[PDB]
Structure formats: structure tokens, C-alpha cells
Amino acid sequence: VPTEEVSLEVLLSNGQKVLVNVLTSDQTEDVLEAVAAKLDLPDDLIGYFSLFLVREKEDGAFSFVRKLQEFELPYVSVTSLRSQEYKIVLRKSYWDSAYDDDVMENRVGLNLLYAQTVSDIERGWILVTKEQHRQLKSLQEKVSKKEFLRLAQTLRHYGYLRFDACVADFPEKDCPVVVSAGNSELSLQLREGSFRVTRMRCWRVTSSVPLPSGGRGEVRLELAFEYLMSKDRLQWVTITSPQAIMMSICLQSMVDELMVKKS
């Protein structure tokens, strides 16, 4: 792409707009740094956050497409799709909530975690009851952002990424499911199954050839993981989802974080 200065909108998880001036030829880290500068996030906290390509739904919720990689040009990544529904989003990009401690030491870091946690509750990524949700929105007014976050850390699926409803062949073929990734596992809510990353020997992403529109082609995508169901017994579990690649990215990211910890 010819180098040119452009304006790029980056959204926070709750849809708040952060406008930055960047180059068409700037890569992910350059854009991330520009966003961090605009927000006054310290350099030493940048590594706790990433940029994601998402589709924004009518209701304002985000369906995550991918985490932008180092070689990518975010302006190009989003513009090349030629649709205003696609957005670049900044979100925390680690899994273990222990790292929240590092981020919350800074006011801007804490504000970012608070913002995305409030939106995670609002969008049902964090699982609470109708009554609990009522209480939370109240506590929200009455407690500090820090106190709110410390409570949120104990809530079901805090720190998980939720995917659009899809289907899986666990427990039976073509079962409707909601998949979420977090805490070193994949959660399948059908009843629930919890599949630990450390018990996955491998996973595979597969796609059909592109098919005529039922002017966009369609592809049938699957993520299958080979799971140690019990001693010496491996079993493939297959999820059919347009977000199979994002799921694969989350599995890799969770495995990577475990390895970094191990080292």
C-alpha cells in the first residue's frame, strides 16, 4: 500500500471511539502504540493489550474475527473488507487474571479493564443471573472501579471470550452450543462441557471450498481438537463455526501463556 497518513477509529470493548492518525503502511505494533499514546497508557503496559478485527452487530455487540498479528497493516486489514460493519478493537489480551494486578496499578490500565468488564457483563460474556446483574449495575454506582473489578474477577466466566452461537458434535452430532475460551479451557454450553487446553494433543482448522452465495462466497469452517477424554483415550471434538480461526487463535494464545508461565 502506498504510504499515506489516515485517520483510524479504534473502539474499546464497550464501543467508545479512539481516533488515531497513523500511516496506511503502519503495522499492528505501530497502531497499538499510537492508540496507547492517545489514551495515555504507559509503554510498559502495552503488551497487556492487543488489537482485534471484529464485526459489529446491529445491537452493537462484537463478533471477534481475529487478533491482528505483527505483520498485519490494521488500516488495510479493516479497509480491504469494504464494509462499515468491521471494526478494530482494543482489548486485554492475556488470560490469567493475576496479570490484572499489573494493569490495575495504572489509572488508565484500570479504566480499560473496568470498561471492558462492564461491557462483558452487559453482553453476557460474564455469566450472572437477572438478579445479580441488577445488583452489579447498582454496585457499579456505589463502589470504586477498583472495587468493582475485584468483585468482577470472581464472577463466572470473567476473562473469557465468547463466540457467536454455533454447533458442535459434543455431546451429540449437530448440537447447538455457545463456546467461550478462557482460564486455559474451552467451555461448551449446550448442560456444559469443559475442555482443558492441557488435555488437547492438537487442534485442526478446516474449511470447505468457497461456495456460491445462498456477492460473498460462503465457507463451512470447523475447529476440531483432539482431547484426552481419559487415560490412553483420545477423542476428536468438532465445532462448526464461522469463527473457527478465532477459536484456534485463542487456543494458541492460551497454550502460549501456559508455556511462558512454565518457563
Partner: peptide, 15 residues
């Protein structure tokens, strides 16, 4: 890569 098989470095069959 995007498609195909990904080996899980974190696989630990130790119960």
C-alpha cells in the same frame, strides 16, 4: 499458518 494441524506445546497427559 491458518489452516491444518496445530501441535499443542502445552499438552500434558500426566493426570
Amino acid at each position: 499458518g491458518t489452516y491444518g494441524v496445530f501441535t499443542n506445546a502445552a499438552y500434558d497427559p500426566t493426570p
